[PDB]
Design brief:
- The structure is a homotrimer.
- Helices cover 21% and strands 37% of the residues of chain A.
- By secondary structure, chain A is of the alpha+beta class.
- Chain A folds into two domains: 16-38 and 309-340, Orthogonal Bundle (Helix Hairpins), CATH 1.10.287; 45-102 and 146-307, atp-gated p2x4 ion channel domain (atp-gated p2x4 ion channel fold).
- Chain A is elongated, with a radius of gyration of 34 Å.
- Chain A starts with a strand and ends with a helix.
- The complex binds the ligand C[C@@H](Nc1cc(N2CCN(C(N)=O)CC2)nc2nc(C3CC3)nn12)c1ccc2ccccc2c1 (3 copies), adenosine-5'-triphosphate (3 copies), 2-acetamido-2-deoxy-beta-D-glucopyranose (9 copies) and magnesium ion (3 copies).
- One adenosine-5'-triphosphate sits between chains C (55-57, 164-166, 192, 207) and B (150, 266-267, 271).
- Chains A, C: Belongs to the P2X receptor family.
- Chains A, C: Its main location: membrane.
- Chains A, C: Extracellular ATP-activated non-selective cation channel. Plays particularly important role in sensory neurons where its activation is critical for gustatory, nociceptive responses, visceral reflexes and sensory hypersensitization.
Chain lengths: 341, 339, 341
């Protein structure tokens, strides 16, 4: 039971050429694009297990003091997100009590203006108008006193341009049981004493200089250090597991993540507050309040791998034979009207 | 050499109508579902690069003291996960030494009951029984003394309902080099001074009120503040790049994430311990231990975008043409067997 | 206006059995692989919403002191990632001033050797050279003094083997509106009082012991606690929503994540520094510096679910009928060449 349809042959006369040309065009597309370029003959994996450990080094001088890594890096646990502080405003010896507010927003002349109103922001309002200075009068509050003044101008820590960052990374593709890290076996204890990362002269040393990371992202240090920002470091593992074990290597990229802040005029940077707590010999308690500007780094990891396997080869190859057989038959029917016309 | 197979024509309009109806049905399905609704003529992109910066404001009174953002928020770095503390239990001036244990599950009547048997809790057992009070007798430990009492009832900080959260977000689609943030160009300082988020009256102000978030999640503040919980805030960027640049818009949603806690009866909330360390003029050291209940927020960002292209259009058009031809040929034999 | 092709039937004994066998094989492949093993008749969902809360308990002796959870666990907010400290090196009462260095990499003979040219990350090199001991001479710096000594040997805290970890997890599949947690409805306080996890004797108690986790990962505590490392805990929710509600359960797995460290000789572990700040009755400020080695745990959640629907069923059935119809038509042309040959 063949059950094969009948077919009639036609002398070419510039029609048989069209038969072979199209029959050869489609067989080109599968070999050229589906197999050789898109690599449809192998199984892909995109779920990657990763791990990042970081460490920073360097010292600087700021406000008649020396600051080391325990002073300007928060949080200290060496994770993949951390901040480097480049500018601070400091208020010393705050205690609980009553004091006048310092900002221009809280101006009053008599006791009536500020009571239960003006509720957004500000501590608890007592309900009196007092003299902040000779020419200014503001409403009294209850809280930590004295209040801070953040309108003055302070210098930045210029030495932070030379600090170094050390990144240690490990990956694993669970489907193929493949493991590698970014510390290559060619790295010796003597090399790490002097190497620095450079994208073409030394693409594998894990030590990055802070001033260069800002440079590769197209920014300016003297301006980013004064308002703060967020920078990203990306590591990519795109590997073909047929070739060899030592052809799998990482690639680094750099960019700036908080792109809205450059063009905005209502919120241009990045800052936060924190405090340190003390206690006297008596029970009294006081603290120190700091407002900090800085640059936030974070490391992002991605990748995928492929390896030859028999099952996707058969499935895609069968579709190739089906496509040419079906493709011609439909091309025959459309050519019947073309030949009839 | 076209080599077209022979074709037989059935003059019956009774079958011609069915042939035409089926062909129109198939072409209708392709032109309506694959193209217009599913938008198969454009290239998708789902890998989004994001960034979140937050800040909190407000003051309240608790235990005859005024507390502010450096007191009730932890960790202080302004990331996308943070906690607001609404209730505390405080133990003052702990030092190292020997003391009895306060809990009733450590009851004893002689030196023999508690030895190396029960390992955890407090510190290291010493092997003696001592009077905790006039009616209770637990057995002694070594560690920070005195131990904390956990069963008393403390009030919550009611003013935490009015605190405000400010969220700043930025995205980028690397395939199309598209960048936008949730601070629209219409925003000004005067608007910043008074706006508040509302899903229909003001859907774009970045300032959120805590009570409103708890309300939108469908919860009750007087219970969430007493047991603790986890709430989620979601921002979605689903926009089409063929239209104008000023119609890619964020959408906000709210929900509660630790849904098992309210059902369960063995662990109903969220709490933790932390301490503060001091030192005397002499070398001696002491500390203050705190157990804190609170609400945890975290911001989640997702999205995808598409843009018209040529290659998917060509592929889908060729698929439609070949499906028309193949669908006809099989239906030809189908009616050939039927009739 | 209907159309049909013409069919030729040849009742060859071999051809009939061949085409029936091939058609049966195609039907078998569709009914066995596509609809049964692969479950093509249902809709998938892989976006999962999760939440994790942890808590640790235990006490131990270390350097004539008793330590508890507020001392050995950082950070303290009970999130997915945390560290347990097993070894420390402590420097007491550091203050600002001038002092000589301690590391052997800073030796002198005369003042001219170490100046601005040698940048070692030292806070500053005042430019002199001073006696450190009776047989060593390094050159002076400015910063927190005295500097720390890093090469001595310290014991590890062995009681950390018996600490316990409590994990509370909640998931939700938004598509099907499905919610469940890892605290099963038949868990009581009395069971909570004494249960421990065991992969076959008790697979649902959420209390894990640290030594058991280290063993399941395939490691050795006596040296993991001495160098440091990173371990992973995985929870997987893979369940079918056609069955009963109480058949969706979690599965636990354990592994080590920083696999590059054990095979390397330039960076074998995981450590970091942090500090505690004090100040006297005067303004004088001093601190205590600690270098910590530990084990970092982190919890990873994943899963997917499926549920019966009608649209994928219709699509797959139509595809199966078309492939059967196309398969017969295509093969017979191919079989004609076999029949002709
Ligand atoms: C191969 C390409 N798309 C295509 C399909 C096609 N057909 C479908 C099969 N078929 C049948 N089952 O009878 C014959 C008709 N004909 C075509 N002709 C062309 C030439 C550019 C003009 N591309 N192309 C593809 C599809 C589906 C694929 C699915 C997974 C991975 C790769 C694919 C890759
Ligand atoms: C179009 C729809 N699935 C379908 C396929 C089909 N065939 C395969 C192609 N083909 C050939 N290559 O000869 C003819 C036979 N015939 C059909 N008939 C129907 C009507 C509902 C009843 N849906 N449908 C699809 C598939 C694959 C798709 C792949 C990517 C994106 C969208 C797709 C969308
Ligand atoms: C079924 C299998 N792949 C296959 C396709 C095929 N085509 C279909 C279109 N078609 C048409 N439109 O005429 C006839 C030609 N023919 C085939 N023959 C074989 C032989 C067993 C090796 N596998 N196989 C598949 C495809 C597409 C699928 C899409 C989604 C999920 C599962 C799929 C699973
Ligand atoms: N949680 C909040 N509630 C109300 N207003 C806020 C909040 N956070 C920020 N703002 C307002 O948004 C504007 C931009 O904030 P920005 O990040 O620039 O703070 P800043 O101006 O650097 O310092 P400050 O905290 O004193 O405003 C500020 O004018 C501030 O008043
Ligand atoms: N790591 C752990 N090891 C052993 N038991 C634990 C652990 N964590 C919690 N539990 C027990 O689980 C129960 C539920 O704890 P929950 O999260 O409600 O904290 P809690 O009731 O405040 O416990 P505690 O008062 O001990 O902090 C408690 O009875 C506690 O004893
Ligand atoms: N940011 C950095 N800049 C320069 N060198 C670094 C940096 N981080 C680490 N190293 C060097 O890498 C080597 C391996 O680091 P690792 O942290 O494992 O050693 P370590 O014993 O902690 O060193 P150290 O005691 O100096 O911190 C060390 O010799 C260290 O000097
Ligand atoms: C950092 O090092 C450079 C030399 O590489 C030096 O010129 C510069 O002064 C240093 N940075 C600062 C701001 O001191
Ligand atoms: C080590 O191998 C890498 C990758 O092949 C190579 O780029 C590098 O130069 C090698 N290093 C040495 C010192 O041979
Ligand atoms: C405690 O003593 C300090 C001086 O050491 C004094 O300033 C303070 O007012 C006293 N506090 C109280 C509550 O008496
Ligand atoms: C918050 O402000 C409202 C007025 O807007 C006030 O009525 C309310 O009492 C405040 N919250 C609390 C709990 O005090
Ligand atoms: C700013 O632009 C958005 C559209 O991007 C618009 O919906 C909004 O109303 C504008 N702002 C105001 C305050 O009108
Ligand atoms: C140190 O002095 C304090 C009083 O200031 C005293 O209580 C303590 O016992 C002394 N230290 C020790 C270890 O005895
Ligand atoms: C933990 O408890 C076991 C008994 O269950 C005990 O033998 C062991 O010594 C304890 N751990 C350590 C290292 O002390
Ligand atoms: C609780 O139910 C599970 C099945 O959901 C069962 O395996 C387990 O044995 C039950 N608990 C006990 C203590 O038997
Ligand atoms: C305060 O006293 C300490 C000693 O306790 C001394 O070192 C310091 O110089 C004094 N500070 C002032 C400002 O006199
Ligand atoms: Mg300000
Ligand atoms: Mg308790
Ligand atoms: Mg060292």
């Amino acid at each position: 039971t063949y059950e094969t349809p009948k077919v009639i042959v036609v002398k070419s006369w510039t029609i048989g050429i069209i038969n072979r040309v199209v029959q050869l065009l489609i067989i080109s597309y599968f070999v050229g694009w589906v197999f050789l370029h898109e690599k449809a003959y192998q199984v892909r994996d995109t779920a990657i297990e990763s791990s990042v450990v970081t460490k920073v080094k360097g010292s600087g001088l700021y406000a008649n003091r020396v600051m080391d890594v325990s002073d300007y890096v928060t949080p200290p646990q060496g994770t993949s997100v951390f901040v480097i502080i480049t500018k601070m405003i400091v208020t010393e010896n705050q205690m609980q009590g009553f004091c006048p507010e310092s900002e221009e927003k809280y101006r009053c002349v008599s006791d009536s203006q500020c009571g239960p109103e003006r509720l957004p922001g500000g501590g608890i309002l007592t309900g009196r108008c007092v003299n902040y200075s000779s020419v200014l009068r503001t409403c009294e509050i209850q809280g930590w006193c004295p209040t801070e003044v953040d309108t003055v101008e302070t210098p930045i820590m210029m030495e932070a341009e030379n600090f170094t960052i050390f990144i240690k990374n490990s990956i694993r593709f669970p489907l193929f049981n493949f493991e590698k890290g970014n510390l290559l076996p060619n790295l010796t204890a003597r090399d790490m004493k002097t190497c620095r990362f450079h994208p073409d002269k030394d693409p594998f040393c894990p030590i990055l200089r802070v001033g260069d990371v800002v440079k590769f992202a197209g920014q300016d240090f003297a301006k980013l250090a004064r308002t703060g920002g967020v920078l990203g470091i990306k590591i990519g593992w795109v590997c073909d597991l047929d070739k060899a074990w030592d052809q799998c290597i990482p690639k680094y990229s750099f960019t700036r993540l908080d792109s809205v802040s450059e063009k905005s005029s209502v919120s241009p940077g990045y800052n936060f507050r924190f405090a340190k707590y003390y206690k006297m010999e008596n029970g009294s308690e006081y603290r120190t309040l700091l407002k900090a500007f800085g640059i936030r780094f974070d490391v992002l990891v991605y990748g995928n791998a492929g390896k030859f396997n028999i099952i996707p080869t058969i499935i895609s190859s069968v579709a190739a034979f089906t496509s040419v057989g079906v493709g011609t038959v439909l091309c025959d029917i459309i050519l019947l009207n073309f030949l009839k016309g």
